[PDB]
Amino acid sequence: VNSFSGYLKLTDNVYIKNADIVEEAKKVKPTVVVNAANVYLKHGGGVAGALNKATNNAMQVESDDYIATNGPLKVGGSCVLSGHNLAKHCLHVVGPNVNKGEDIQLLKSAYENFNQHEVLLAPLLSAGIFGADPIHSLRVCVDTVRTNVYLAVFDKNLYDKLVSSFL
Ligand SMILES: CC[C@@H](Nc1ncnc2[nH]ccc12)[C@H](C)O
Ligand SMILES: [Cl-]
């Protein structure tokens, strides 16, 4: 039993809700919140910009030190950093950005990072401003993640489309 509330159950392990991931994180304080990161951990817009803003830029400060030490992530890769005031940890995961020409096959690799954590609050990887088809992202999530994932879909209209089209 966990403290996530109001989610629709899609499979044994995948749950979904129309919600602002920032507000959800502040309410639940999950062990892991997933960020829709880029390889530079430059948290400018979309989920990343919103999460970072909610940390008063502390996420960006921590991220800049991470990059200065370790260099960029790989597309499909991840790193674990602090969750600041939002969660215990933030798993920064880089899905492919179609608006940059990146290979959509890397979306499965990106979701594999979730399997290193028993429970996560997450967005749909490569959706929104990353330019992939969200119906596809949800399918890859369900077919790749085996741990317990609570998906927050910001756009209510998109949430309804995702539910009504889910196979
Ligand atoms: C990744 C695509 C989704 N983006 C988000 N999902 C959940 N919480 C969010 N907070 C700020 C953006 C955002 C879109 C609504 O389908
Ligand atoms: Cl987005």
Q: Which has the closest alpha carbon to 80: 103, 59, 56, 108?
A: 59
Task: Count Cβ neighbours within 10 Å for each residue of 54-70 and write b for 16 or more, e otherwise.
Answer: bbeeebbebbeebeeee
Please give the CATH number for the structural domain made up of 8-163.
Answer: 3.40.220.10
Ligand 1 pocket mutation pick from 20, 47, 126 by most atoms within 8 angstroms of CB: 47
By the 8 A CB rule, do 11 and 143 touch? no
Method by which this entry was solved: X-ray
